[PDB]
């Protein structure tokens, strides 16, 4: 179980229309992931949520998705 902020390129959490970075922060379903498996700090994960929701509204990012295998 790797760490999904902890290897990636430096960026803007306030950029709501950038998928390729953001969708990395989601899950095997559509859920925004815990600081545990991201590694963003306090302030970080706040802004992250807020923009991820911004994108979800804007259509780019999922509200949900289904677990595969089982």
């Amino acid at each position: 179980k790797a760490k999904v902020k902890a290897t990636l390129g430096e960026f803007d959490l306030r950029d709501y229309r950038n998928v390729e970075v953001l969708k990395r922060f989601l899950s095997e379903t559509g859920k925004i992931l815990p600081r545990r498996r991201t590694g963003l700090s306090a302030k970080e994960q706040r802004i992250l949520a807020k923009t991820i929701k911004r994108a979800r509204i804007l259509g780019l990012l999922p509200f949900t998705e289904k677990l595969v295998r089982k």
Binding site: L58, G59, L60
Partner: protein, 101 residues
Amino acid sequence: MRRYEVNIVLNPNLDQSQLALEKEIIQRALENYGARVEKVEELGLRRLAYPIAKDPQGYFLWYQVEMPEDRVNDLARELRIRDNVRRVMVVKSQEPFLANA
């Protein structure tokens, strides 16, 4: 005046003429609610996570404007109107806070 990012996502299946019509009306009303455009980007037809209007794709543009604050809401409401507009969002613009920190 204040600085805002205008996101307009519209109906993908507009051919050029239609598309420039909606593109235009966006612009004329934009100009008529007093909103000067500091910048624009048309990133075009991007695909969607969930269907909007059962349409897996939508057509995106963006306008950074300086406009009188009182009217921002109203202006949104005008761009809203069009049937070919799918989604509208005004952001108040932001200095870009930084990541992996």
